[PDB]
Design a protein around this ligand. Structure first.
Ligand SMILES: *OCCCCCCNc1c(NCCOCCO[C@H]2O[C@H](CO)[C@@H](O)[C@H](O)[C@@H]2O)c(=O)c1=O
Ligand SMILES: *OCCCCCCNc1c(NCCOCCO[C@H]2O[C@H](CO)[C@@H](O)[C@H](O)[C@@H]2O)c(=O)c1=O
Ligand SMILES: *OCCCCCCNc1c(NCCOCCO[C@H]2O[C@H](CO)[C@@H](O)[C@H](O)[C@@H]2O)c(=O)c1=O
Ligand SMILES: *OCCCCCCNc1c(NCCOCCO[C@H]2O[C@H](CO)[C@@H](O)[C@H](O)[C@@H]2O)c(=O)c1=O
Ligand SMILES: [Ca+2]
Ligand SMILES: [Ca+2]
Ligand SMILES: [Ca+2]
Ligand SMILES: [Ca+2]
Ligand SMILES: [Mn+2]
Ligand SMILES: [Mn+2]
Ligand SMILES: [Mn+2]
Ligand SMILES: [Mn+2]
Lengths: 232, 233, 233, 232
DNA sequence: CGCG
DNA sequence: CGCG
DNA sequence: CGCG
DNA sequence: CGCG
């Protein structure tokens, strides 16, 4: 399979596969069964912000998700990603729907990698164009609509569709850990708009790191958030 | 053909095809016959530095090349790159040898692109090069890992630079260099190099280039063509 | 006197002292009588954006001012700032009112300086302004904390802009803008603003300026003097 | 007194005041008695590198000190700096000598602060000039010698002097924590050269954060590393 | 750039 | 939100 | 920029 | 590296 390290924004509780009984941010290592979660006060129709953090010193992958004039949700997890991910990886955003639906609109996406042995990579998207050549769009992902990236399908009228799954990956491979490295670090930021006219919103957005050749697994709509082929 | 916009560091004056009678920095638009050149006091065996700058406001592609405790060579040229290059491009370094030889060692390479239309941005910095660099497309004789440097032309096991060589490094991701509905667009590019030649005739040179995404080394672009051009038109 | 190099956004044509017959962006070297101006379609009540750029290679101080879904105004001027400004300077925003009035609200302000001689660098970005901003020297009527914005000229409790007002924000740290033994020197400056006037005569304007470290608002630099100049020479 | 948060590079063991029996990196909160230390293989005469890290999510101040072709030393400590430092602070380098001497040469100094409520500050020094107007030099600190910052005094010949103390602070105050802030972070980097012809080298270099008006305390040469007035 |  |  |  |  693909090797997956993700930060999940789960909006629908799949209690069948260990999700808590409420919308959660979670830190996912190689399994949709998060290794740590937190209660997340999802605001239907409000534009939200996600900062994900890791360095080689603290070896702690942390994330904050937050809305204007509101409290935040934090989740952290201690993991050596040098023992999990290959040296070279791709970084990406994923999203899915199932029986229930939501828009998976990405307005902004920023990512920075540093290796003091210094080597560096930084990209920032605030507008998305119709032909975004430095993005690998997989599944139902689309660019150009209001200058935003729409990871799952949404009607001309605006109505989000169900049983949808799509991903954006940055075109260039990233060196996220080096053999002879003193410090390695990455920051990742994105703003999003999950809006659902149906009061049961599903299924969620995730930042992920994966092997370079990563592709949407067979039937990864819904509970699998476009990352995992099974709920193991 | 490929569309090429390059900054050439010509160490070998090919007077035959319009090169001045001396080693020159030049600004090359779609032709190896530079549209602007300047005298460059190339120092055999010394590590040197190249800054290249362009913006949508000044629409002026400029370059400075320099060695520690020595004077600089500057070249500028007014060109709307929105009228020359496609929207999406790759940025790269090229180098060649021919009748003579030189090492075309790159120790560092930095590039930044900005589009305010609310800014979109790409920045990469290489100070070490690994044996398996997946964020680089090596074409021709180009190789990485030797002293953690990028060697664009071939170097014998013995350490001596080889002749009739040509190789290019391109950054893996395509870059958006201009958009119609953008207010300001800009790029900076920096690289350090080591041109060293045991032969007192050093040839042929190093160049920063921007090109169509799918760009590839032209056949027989060894020598005066610097791995960019198929002909000296 | 203070030495001033400024980019003026003149909303009130003072034809008396060489302002063109319309609202203009201008490049001001040591005189309010700009050494280059351009027609600026100022939009009352709309948030606008200003990019200002200069390098040691092109020695050309350039500026773009623009509002969303509208054309830009550009101005450039060739000047060696190494021949004008001292080595160390402060960078600042200024604004004034006089016969009429306007709000001189600054929502954002970004500035970057680089000296490669191995690069020395300074960058600050303000998107919020707090009530107690210790990294800013407010002079005159300038104030912070109102909506998290910087209000260079006075605004009544009622919300209406006041006349015969002048205030300036300077970044606390001195900046090294040029060195003798430097190969490349550069600065970028960005700020968003809101000029809104209930009076259909809006006055007087906003300006980015560089100046000697100890620079201070000249006496009676309200109005056509934009808080930079003591006289209209 | 001044309010002090420092990362100490202690080269001489003052066992009198809790220093371990060997050269250590340590994380100092309001006392020269570090709240955590680590063994540091100081290389006399070799140029070394120091990365210091903190964010509001992990609330963990961490540091790595290292030399080329050698293993590193790490020290971390969990502390809310919003409960320790005032909102506005100055960031600085300090160094001292006592009975025993060393050079306290700084070749490089970089510092970055971020507040997503984004506000930002970044300065990088690779050369130091004779009149460095954006630095507040206190005590014996000097700039211009080889383009380096010399925090303690060193003879024309090169010989480092004893009972010396000097500090560099960046001119501008820094906002290191905001009331209504989602994320706050700072990185700090500096290269240094501690060289001692006397085989007993003392006393050390520190990165510090302090109240804006901070000044070298009375008799803070030696064990006090130019930060503390007493060894409490 | 140096030699014929 | 439906099915045991 | 609009009014005398 | 000196002093109990
Ligand atoms: O109208 C809103 C009603 C609230 C919904 C019920 C929430 N409670 C709940 C469920 N739901 C059952 C799980 O399976 C439902 C069908 O599964 C499909 O739909 C979702 C939506 O995208 C997807 O995650 C699945 O993979 C699949 O596509 C619990 O388990 C629980 O608690
Ligand atoms: O101060 C300026 C130095 C003057 C150099 C004079 C040139 N020396 C020289 C020539 N002249 C003719 C050049 O073409 C012959 C060489 O051809 C091959 O060698 C070079 C080496 O890269 C290459 O540019 C060509 O394209 C070709 O591969 C000599 O014959 C000689 O020696
Ligand atoms: O499309 C361009 C608009 C044309 C504007 C015409 C000017 N309107 C105007 C004048 N003309 C003389 C200007 O000086 C008198 C005003 O003096 C005070 O007001 C301004 C406001 O900031 C200031 O610049 C001056 O320095 C002084 O404080 C009027 O009298 C009038 O109305
Ligand atoms: O020639 C090298 C010999 C090694 C030195 C001894 C190390 N062992 C040791 C000490 N030393 C006694 C502490 O006080 C000594 C005098 O103190 C003065 O000198 C130092 C040097 O800068 C300074 O830290 C003091 O504040 C004061 O200025 C231990 O305690 C221990 O273990
Ligand atoms: Ca779920
Ligand atoms: Ca040539
Ligand atoms: Ca005016
Ligand atoms: Ca000590
Ligand atoms: Mn989940
Ligand atoms: Mn040429
Ligand atoms: Mn004017
Ligand atoms: Mn200690």
């Amino acid at each position: 399979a693909d090797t997956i390290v993700a930060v999940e924004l789960d909006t629908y509780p799949n209690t069948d596969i260990g999700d808590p009984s409420y919308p959660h941010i979670g830190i996912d290592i190689k399994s949709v069964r998060s290794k740590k979660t937190a209660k997340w006060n999802m605001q239907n129709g409000k534009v939200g912000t996600a900062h994900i953090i890791y360095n080689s010193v603290d070896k702690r992958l942390s994330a904050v998700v937050s809305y204007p004039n509101a409290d935040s949700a934090t989740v952290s997890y201690d993991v050596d990603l040098d023992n999990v991910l290959p040296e070279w990886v791709r970084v990406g955003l994923s999203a899915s729907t199932g029986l229930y639906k939501e828009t998976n609109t990405i307005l902004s996406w920023s990512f920075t990698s540093k290796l003091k042995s210094t080597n560096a990579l930084h990209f920032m998207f605030n507008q998305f164009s119709k032909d975004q050549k430095d993005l690998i769009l997989q599944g139902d992902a689309t660019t150009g609509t209001d200058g935003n990236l729409e990871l799952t399908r949404v009607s001309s009228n605006g109505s989000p569709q169900g049983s949808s799954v799509g991903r954006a990956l940055f075109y260039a491979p990233v060196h996220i850990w080096e053999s002879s490295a003193v410090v390695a670090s990455f920051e990742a930021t994105f703003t999003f708009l999950i809006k659902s006219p149906d009061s049961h919103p599903a299924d969620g957005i995730a930042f992920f790191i994966s092997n370079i050749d990563s592709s949407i697994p067979s039937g990864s709509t819904g509970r699998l958030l476009g990352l995992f082929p099974d709920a193991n």
